[PDB]
Amino acid sequence: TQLNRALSGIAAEQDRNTREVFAQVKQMYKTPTLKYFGGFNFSQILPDP
Amino acid sequence: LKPTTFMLKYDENGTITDAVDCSQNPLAELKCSVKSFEIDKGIYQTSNF
Numbered sequence: 001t002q003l004n005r006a007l008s009g010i011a012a013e014q015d016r017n018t019r020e021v022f023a024q025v026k027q028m029y030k031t032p033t034l035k036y037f038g039g040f041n042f043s044q045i046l047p048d049p
Numbered sequence: 050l051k052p053t054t055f056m057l058k059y060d061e062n063g064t065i066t067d068a069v070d071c072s073q074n075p076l077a078e079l080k081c082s083v084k085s086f087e088i089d090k091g092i093y094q095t096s097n098f
């Protein structure tokens with residue numbers, strides 16, 4: 001009983017470590033079709049839809 | 050009489066006031082683990098199958 005509380009206690013922080021990094025974002029924005037914002041090319045950084 | 054597992058709550062005077070069957074349903078299989086009668090919302094860990 002004490003072992004599974006230890007590994008699931010480790011496993012629960014691996015969710016907390018990922019949410020404290022990526023999930024700082026309140027809202028989902030769309031992918032812009034514009035990709036030269038003044039000649040700054042951005043197809044490699046944006047997802048290719 | 051059958052050999053199952055019960056959890057018992059004793060008062061200030063050693064009187065059994067309430068009891069829980071640990072083999073009735075999964076909700077009461079949970080209360081025997083955490084040692085409480087009123088259990089908060091979430092996933093808790095129980096015995097494996």
Ligand SMILES: *[C@@H]1O[C@H](CO)[C@@H](O[C@@H]2O[C@H](CO)[C@@H](O)[C@H](O)[C@H]2NC(C)=O)[C@H](O)[C@H]1NC(C)=O
Pocket residue numbers: 035036041042043
């Ligand atoms: C951003 O740079 C990329 C480099 O891959 C350009 O993509 C290529 O553009 C040429 C000519 O336009 C095409 O022949 C290729 O097929 C493109 N490759 C891919 C993978 O799409 C892209 O045109 C540039 N975009 C802007 C806005 O400057």
Ligand SMILES: *[C@@H]1O[C@H](CO)[C@@H](O[C@@H]2O[C@H](CO)[C@@H](O)[C@H](O)[C@H]2NC(C)=O)[C@H](O)[C@H]1NC(C)=O
Pocket residue numbers: 060061062
């Ligand atoms: C445990 O037993 C004691 C008796 O020794 C109870 O205390 C008495 O309770 C009655 C009724 O509530 C009161 O009128 C008395 O004044 C109490 N006496 C003392 C010395 O406290 C107590 O209530 C019992 N507790 C439980 C949880 O059953």
